[PDB]
Every structure is written in C-alpha cells, then in structure tokens.
C-alpha cells in the first residue's frame, strides 16, 4: 500500500532547504536554534 | 508406491529424467527413495528393450527423454538407441535385476541418504 513518504528532491529542497529557512524570520530562528545546539546539518 | 514429496506430474517427470540419466551415465548418485522408485522404471524399460519390437520401442519412447549421447569418437546416438542397442544386448541372458543400489550415507546439506544406483 502507498506510504506517507514519497521522496522528491525538488519538494524537499523547496520546503526544508536553506534558502526557504532564510526566507522567514521563524526559519532563521530554526537555523539559529540548530547552530546553537551544534548540529552538523542545519537544513536540506 | 512412493510419492517422493511431489505432485503426480512432477514425480512422473523426475522419474523419466532419472531413468534417462541412468541409461546414459550407467551409474548415478541420488537419494534412497528416488533410487528405490526408479529401479522399477529403468528395469521395465530394459524389458522393453529386450523385447525389441517396434511397439516396444514406441512404448519405451513414451518414457525416455530425447537426449543425445556422443559416443567414442564424434558419433552420436539417442538414449532410446542405446537402450535398444548396447543395453538390451548386455542383458539378453539375465532375467530381471538389471540394477543395484549401494548406500553411501548421509550428505552434509540435509542429512539425506545418498546412494549409488548402477546398471548391473
């Protein structure tokens, strides 16, 4: 049966990518939180 | 008679293959139950070959496979030709009992009893 995750490079980059995060204040808050926690990966 | 863990069509086909392989190679290694079943098939075939007539040859053709055998030097013959040629002549004066089974013991993969069945 069809499952929830149907991968799509373009969709993934456009919704969760770096530039989409930079595009809003709350996305920049996400990036700041992840930098503060010390994550290796900040976004897609 | 044994079922050999196969359907009737599969069992019939396997017995034909084993009988033809025995006729060709004259000595094969198989499991105990398969050999005990195929001794009857092969010996009835040899009986037909000793009979020798055209009807016997066609009845034998009902059971034998269509395999070719390269003989001493690049000369071919069929398993049916060998059965009605050399094999039948070898057993002209023998009344039954053209095969024997020699037990070898269990084999590694499944513990099955390996045996050799050969033409006498």
């Amino acid at each position: 049966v069809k499952r929830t995750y149907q991968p799509n490079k373009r969709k993934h980059s456009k919704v969760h990518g770096f530039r989409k995060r930079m595009s809003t204040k709350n996305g920049r808050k996400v990036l700041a939180r992840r930098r503060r926690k010390g994550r290796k990966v900040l976004s897609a | 008679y044994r079922k050999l863990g196969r359907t009737s069509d599969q069992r019939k086909a396997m017995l034909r293959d084993l009988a033809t392989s025995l006729i060709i190679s004259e000595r094969i290694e198989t499991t105990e139950a398969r050999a005990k079943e195929v001794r009857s098939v092969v010996e009835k075939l040899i009986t037909l070959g000793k009979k020798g007539d055209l009807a016997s040859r066609r009845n034998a053709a009902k059971t034998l496979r269509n395999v070719e055998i390269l003989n001493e030097d690049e000369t071919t013959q069929t398993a049916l030709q060998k059965l009605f040629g050399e094999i039948a002549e070898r057993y002209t004066e023998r009344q039954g009992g053209y095969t024997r089974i020699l037990k070898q013991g269990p084999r590694r993969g499944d513990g099955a009893e390996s045996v050799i069945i050969e033409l006498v």
Partner: protein, 44 residues
C-alpha cells in the same frame, strides 16, 4: 496458551532425559577405518 509458571532447572532436565543421539551403527572395514553398516566405503 502460555506457561503459567517458569520451568525449573529440575523439570527441564527431567524432560531432557530422553533428548539425546545414539552411537552410529558402525562396523570395522575388514580391508578398506570404520564404516556405517550396510553402506559402501565411498571414500576408500
């Protein structure tokens, strides 16, 4: 459907009383070491 109580060491070994294998039926090879009775050497 499920064990009501665990099986003690004593009961388990009692049950395993008959869980064993037997010595093979074997005979010395008069000419060709030892072999299974009613079997050919197949290696000698």
């Amino acid at each position: 459907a499920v064990p009501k109580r665990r099986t003690s060491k004593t009961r388990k070994n009692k049950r395993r009383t008959h869980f064993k294998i037997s010595v093979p039926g074997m005979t010395e090879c008069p000419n060709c070491e030892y072999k299974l009775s009613h079997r050919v050497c197949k290696n000698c």
